Design a protein around this ligand. Structure first.
Ligand SMILES: COc1ccc(Cl)cc1NC(=O)Nc1ccc2nc(NC(=O)c3ccccc3)sc2c1
Length: 289
């Protein structure tokens, strides 16, 4: 545990932001955290119990978070383990999760009024893709990549996480098996559902489905279908349709992520490359896409 630590007295709770079965999130002020801010806002996760079950999973999640740090991964500042309750401290991300942001832009300080423009939808996709290049670079497999597990900050910075609360707030996006197991079948490729195999390449398939959620402003993939009807479609090889707002050039990058054979899918590095070049493209070019 080369994990950073914060003293209880440096954290001041303001109010609740959200709740899962195994946690609560608060907005707080953290003192003496950054040289040139002596006062800044953060999001704090309180652990429900402090047993054998939940305290080992805590110091494991922390070690993971400290090693994962990059421009498009959520910023983890460290733990407070003096008395209870055990707290993890993160960067505050003012627009909340990317699914909720997409749905309420389908005007302000950070975004124009009306629906998000082609250049904005590309800027979001390109950022999530840069996160998945760093993770695939450390040979780390996510297993739950979707818009509900990304966050949006001031100036539309977009960063990946993996939040405990997503099974609680968004249970409709999971199929329940056995007792306490939940699978995001709408976001999984055929080899994940049939053979239970999870790879770098099942992540790019999931990225494909994220790019689809972005270009439908937060729509549930296969929303017309029961969980069993969605598994039948995916295993029999059927593809999600091109969203209206989706240019054919972009729907071609989605298709590249959905090639039935894992080893025929484009690498995430090529996908980020295609998306960043587009997001940065001169307007004269985006206008006729
Ligand atoms: C196995 O763990 C991982 C593996 C791989 C990755 Cl890349 C990340 C994780 N872990 C997390 O990402 N953890 C997490 C959990 C809850 C939570 N609550 C937040 N919620 C707000 O910060 C929030 C912000 C604005 C409004 C409301 C809530 S951050 C967070 C991260």
């Amino acid at each position: 545990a080369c994990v950073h630590h914060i003293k209880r007295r440096d954290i001041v709770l303001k109010w609740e932001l959200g709740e899962g079965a195994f946690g609560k999130v608060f907005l707080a002020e953290c003192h003496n955290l950054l040289p040139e801010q002596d006062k800044m806002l953060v999001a704090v996760k309180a652990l429900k119990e402090a047993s054998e079950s939940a305290r080992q999973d805590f110091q494991r999640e922390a070690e993971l978070l400290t090693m994962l740090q990059h421009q498009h991964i959520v910023r983890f500042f460290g733990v407070c383990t003096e008395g209870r309750p055990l707290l993890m401290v993160f960067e505050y991300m003012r627009h909340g999760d990317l699914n909720r942001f997409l749905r309420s832009h389908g005007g302000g300080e950070d975004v124009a009024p009306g629906p998000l423009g082609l250049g904005q939808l590309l800027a979001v996709a390109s950022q999530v893709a840069a996160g998945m290049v760093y993770l695939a670079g450390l040979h780390f497999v996510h297993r739950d990549l979707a818009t509900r597990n990304c966050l949006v900050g001031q100036g539309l910075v977009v960063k990946i996480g993996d939040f405990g609360m997503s099974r609680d707030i968004y249970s409709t996006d999971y199929y329940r098996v056995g007792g306490r197991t939940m699978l995001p079948i709408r976001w999984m490729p055929p080899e994940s559902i049939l053979y239970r195999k999870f790879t770098t390449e099942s992540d790019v398939w999931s990225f494909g489905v994220v790019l689809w959620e972005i270009f439908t402003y937060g729509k549930q993939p296969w929303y017309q279908l029961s969980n069993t009807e969605a598994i039948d479609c995916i295993t029999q090889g059927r593809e999600l349709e091109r969203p209206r707002a989706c240019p054919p050039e972009v729907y071609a990058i989605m298709r590249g992520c959905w090639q039935r054979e894992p080893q025929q899918r484009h690498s995430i590095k090529d996908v980020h490359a295609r998306l960043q070049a587009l997001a940065q493209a001169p307007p004269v070019y985006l206008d006729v896409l």
